[PDB]
Design an enzyme around this catalytic site. Sequence first.
Site: not given
Lengths: 116, 268, 239, 118, 235, 248, 252, 126, 46
Positions: F119-121
């Site tokens: 997940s990019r966050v």
Amino acid sequence: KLQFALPHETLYSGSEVTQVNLPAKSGRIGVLANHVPTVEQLLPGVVEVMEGSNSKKFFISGGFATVQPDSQLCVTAIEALESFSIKNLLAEAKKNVSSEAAEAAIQVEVLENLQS
Amino acid sequence: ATLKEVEMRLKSIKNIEKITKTMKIVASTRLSKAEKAKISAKKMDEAEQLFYKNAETKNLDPKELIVAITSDKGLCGSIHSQLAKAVRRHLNDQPNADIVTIGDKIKMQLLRTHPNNIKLSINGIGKDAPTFQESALIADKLLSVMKAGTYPKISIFYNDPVSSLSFEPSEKPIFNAKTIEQSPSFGKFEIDTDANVPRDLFEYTLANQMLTAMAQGYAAEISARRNAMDNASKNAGDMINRYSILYNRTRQAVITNELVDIITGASS
Amino acid sequence: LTIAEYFRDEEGQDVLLFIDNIFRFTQAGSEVSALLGRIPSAVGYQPTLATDMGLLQERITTTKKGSVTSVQAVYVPADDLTDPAPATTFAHLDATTVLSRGISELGIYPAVDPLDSKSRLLDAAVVGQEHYDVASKVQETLQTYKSLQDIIAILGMDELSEQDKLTVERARKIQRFLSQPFAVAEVFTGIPGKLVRLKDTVASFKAVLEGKYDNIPEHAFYMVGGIEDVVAKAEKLAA
Amino acid sequence: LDAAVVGQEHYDVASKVQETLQTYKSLQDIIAILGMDELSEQDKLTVERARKIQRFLSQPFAVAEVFTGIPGKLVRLKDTVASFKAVLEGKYDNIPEHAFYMVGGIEDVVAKAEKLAA
Amino acid sequence: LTIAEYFRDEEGQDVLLFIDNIFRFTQAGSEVSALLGRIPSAVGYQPTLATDMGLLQERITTTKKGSVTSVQAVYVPADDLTDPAPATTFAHLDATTVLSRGISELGIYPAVDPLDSKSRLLDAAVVGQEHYDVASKVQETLQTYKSLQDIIAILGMDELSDKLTVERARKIQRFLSQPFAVAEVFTGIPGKLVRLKDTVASFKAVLGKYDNIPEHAFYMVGGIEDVVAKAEKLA
Amino acid sequence: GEWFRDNGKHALIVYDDLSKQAVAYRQLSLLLRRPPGREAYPGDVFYLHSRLLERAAKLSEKEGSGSLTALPVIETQGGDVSAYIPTNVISITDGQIFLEAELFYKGIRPAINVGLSVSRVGSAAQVKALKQVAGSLKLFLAQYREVAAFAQDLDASTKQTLVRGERLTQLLKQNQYSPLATEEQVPLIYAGVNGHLDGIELSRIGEFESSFLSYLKSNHNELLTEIREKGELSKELLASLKSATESF
Amino acid sequence: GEWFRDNGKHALIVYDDLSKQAVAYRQLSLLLRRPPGREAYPGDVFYLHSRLLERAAKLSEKEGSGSLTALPVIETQGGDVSAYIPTNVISITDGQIFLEAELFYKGIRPAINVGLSVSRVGSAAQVKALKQVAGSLKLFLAQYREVAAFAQSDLDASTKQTLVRGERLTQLLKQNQYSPLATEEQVPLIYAGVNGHLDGIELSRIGEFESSFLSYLKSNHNELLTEIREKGELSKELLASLKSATESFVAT
Amino acid sequence: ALKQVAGSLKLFLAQYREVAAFAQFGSDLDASTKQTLVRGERLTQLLKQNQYSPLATEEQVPLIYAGVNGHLDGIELSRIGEFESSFLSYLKSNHNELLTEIREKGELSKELLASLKSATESFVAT
Amino acid sequence: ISYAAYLNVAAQAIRSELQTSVLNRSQTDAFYTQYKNASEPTPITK
């Protein structure tokens, strides 16, 4: 207690025997139950093992016999039976091939008594 | 990418998948002779060493002869790896020694680490189960061309199958004619001091202890080759099926692209 | 498909529809779509592959009156499951019934494969935790039996340990208790057919899994009906 | 990448990194099926070193730290060249490969190497 | 074609026609096909490929008037034998001599692949029973390599039981090479021209009597008398 | 889903199946004599998924802070993630949860491939409590997969973690329709990064979950209320955690 | 040929070859400005071959019982059998007979890959005498091919004999062109193989064995052949006499 | 003169390519395989060249000769590169007469070839 | 000549129909090869 042994198959392994006749380098002597510890080389002959009174005879390749202090017998050879056992192409092609070759004379001594 | 390269690459792996599995059976079906010749040798080993035990034979107080025991055939695992190190590591303590190597895949590591130590090597043996005639002849040369009788210490390095999934580098000693008769408890046995018994006893225990070492050595190998190629057929699986998908990903893209040019050039 | 619809919309029965082969429905669609002049899609199939298959398969559902169950034979072009033909078809397929020749080779009828055939409704929340647990033990045991084929072929059978030889016995029997004499092949086999109902099968196998029939020979399972038909055959083989 | 712009040493090092990585690449199959065992010591060494080169080329980024969890370390050119040269010569053929993973300079490898030793 | 054609019928004599290259014929038909306004065929070729080749090859036949012996050179696009160009040509030839890039890299010249070059004259009732018999043994020895080779790449020639036949592959294949006088600026090796009967009696002996000399001795040599003179100069 | 976004609320839009949408959009285009591209898809198949999935985002403070969350679904063929459509969506969605059939059959469910999933966050979107108990666990299991492959010579150190990841991943095997609260997930993650469940054998590793849950119903209900209301771990509770979990 | 079928007679038609007819129809359709399909072939390139082959059939006793058998020929490129046209025809025919180049050069003629070549009807349309002697022959070779690789070193007992049989079975299946054998000359040669009366003969003379053995039967056991020819089945007394005739030649 | 030093180098290099197919497991080399593997591998490094650094005909002839005739086998693998510039220096100093003959004549005769044969062996040792 | 040889000969005599393994021990392929400072003299058979 006999312990007949071969590289490919073991015959006896601590089995109880009454008397065994081993063809030493000297003369075929029967090893008693409580025989004195000796170490003598075995020349090709007949090994008689007495299980009680039953008779078992094997033809031996040749190795070493050893009586241990614990009256235990150690017989070894290359290949050991009688009911499972003519080669004469060695008295000319081998015996007279004198120039492996020069020593090609042990062959005759083995087969002569094999018939016996 | 190529129409064909992914198919002929799938072929040189699809048949590699069966070949490692076909040799796994050969190694697994030959484990029967391995687990037999292993017990037969060991049982004769006890019969042969009991004299050496009750006689209390041990090495006298800078030559020593080292014998390496392995095969020429690869595809067996780290059996030629760990054993060669056991030798090298034992050689470090006494650099002053000559090494006879049985099998070429053991001559590999030794030619690298200690090239000059190797004074003799046996070729093309490790393929079948060992025989007495084979060893008795190896000892005959060891005795002749090498003059082992002039050595104060003999050491045989082989592989011992502790478990059916793991082997174990080991070492056994061979005592010369002089070391036998000078044994502490040697008089314990009645022996005629004339028929050169101690001399004949060494030349005979030299061949047997080799075969006993070979028997367990080529048994631990077959047990290690099955293992080595069971992981191979499984590893050939993540290839025959991996590139299999890649073949289709290319086949579907070949039929489509081959069809696009037709439709494009049909609009005119 | 229209024929089978009537016996659902008008008689509320459980109608069976057989399509053999289902792939030629897709292939014929491509030919027609191509004849009409439409631009061939991926791999040369009809661009309307999604909808075409949809219009047909969707009419095979369970209504409030009855239900239509289709058993369609699927051909897989070049043994490729990513091909647009099966990839689209399989989307509608619920369960599969694989008839291997390897099971038939063992003389087992029907020649259904226990490990290949799978169902989307093999869920504890559908057939019950009971049925579920029984089924999973059956498959899992046979799966460990297929793996033993390796050492058994060369070593023998004495290599099996306590748990290793106790389970194989069940396997040797379960694999034979799955075969069933059909009433249709009666005028060919001579053997009268036995319809084994859902309720019985679950109970029959569970008992064997526990080990309450390890005494019964492996032959009293070959070509038999329910579990009762095993007992009656166990005492007739002793005579 | 010419010995004229980056100097003969930089080119020599970079080259000796490529030469090695191709050897490990051209054997990806051999290893994946047979295993390192079937490869000679010559290959055995080169391969083992490449496995360390490739994992040491790994470097955390400052911006990625938001989902990576590992602090991003920036390494300057000079340190890079000297470091990779050392590994090639055999100055670090005894350090675990996992010590090269996600690190900065060579001085950071010895840091992670011992913290994982104990 | 029309030129050689006249020497067949109207001149009543034996003709000999060389085409090079025949592939450029269909290739040229491909270029125009699109331009002329045609819907391209598979592999971008022309819709009329088997009939263009037909209306060409069919005129190169032997009639009651005269006979025509044709030697056509065919180019294979990307060495891909499945290409419609080489494909359609095969079915028109009574005999073939496939050239592969793999055979020349061995050293043997010409680069004739012995496992795709097949003539319809290979009949017992044609070249003589002996001829055929010998020719069949030569073919048997070879194919096994291509299939059994996988053992050699994984181990070599040690597991070979079959072991005497697996080695004749590296001997017969070498003996097939023949020196030429035309290609002097390629090897510099003087050419040799063997005849019909000589090659037959030469192979039968090898198929392992001449198994004593390994590698070179059958490489770039004449008949069988040459092999004796090349075995002397120990290499 | 946008009405709830524009009106300062919250919505969760889930597309399924997106692959099945693409195919349908390829149907029309072809019938419309639109030039076929890769896999016979038109050129603007990216534009279809691009102007769609971007309608999902967290709005600004002055705009109302209404957020629309998207969860696109893509049906791969043979796990081929390098396909045209599958790659197109990944170039739009900042994050991927790849489910591998390999792990599904084994029983590891969900079959989330740590190696390909990210997940990019992370910390940004993850609850602080979970952020502490999960010290780069993603990088541990991603490297752990290398231990369970090459090992199959018994080791000591690197083989030690083999026992860790074995029971850690097996602990993650969550059933269907069995959601868990944030406070119920936090204790489990801490019983792994240090190996607090090492003692339990591969059989009841999931049983401990049902057991420890009961132990909180009344015996340790004090902890549950803290994490639920705050959502952040403190040094106070950090030391209070090493005891209630030490009992088992 | 359909004329013969319609009048109670039997006809066999060979299409040599259908691969080239397809190309022809492609040439027509392409020039006629018709929509191209996979690999340029029109849409109904399948219906072309389907129309044709499905015309071959064995009519019911009701009309004439005449039969039209069809042996279509497909020329495959590089062995590929998954191409459009090839797979198309295959999915229509009631069986396939495959020929490999590998076996062709090896010496096996006709080079038949039994592993792929299989008839659907099969047993039902075979001489009962041949069906009896070669029932297991189909399997034998199917297991011989996979065990054939074991050549490369030691043989136990279970696979020691299998390698002995097939090694001469296929050597016997070798048959020179223009030399068709009658079913009456087949069963003797197949009986000797399957049962194992040839297992103890050097392959070098297995070829000549076929001839001398058949000439021995025609001369001495002419009756044994004439009952197989006429009856087409093997009776218990007949099949038994067959064994004696075989083992009698094995001695001389 | 380039034709002489390179009789069948190309064909040999192509045959050295297939040699490395079996040489991957670590099998003991025989006579027909050991000779070629050593020479064939050292010829590889010998034919390597740097950009913007073209060599003349009189510079190539010697380098190739020392490889095909049998002289570079003794040299160590890692010392192959250095050998190039070193061997050319020795020439441009001592037997410089040879180099100016290769350029002018263009063709190697028995006379020159004999001289080159001697010159080469002179540098292999010391 | 060695004592192991004086025994080998006898083991060959006991090769005297139903001699299965038994034939695997009847003979062997052996090649010994001396070595020097590694260099090695000509490889002969046993």
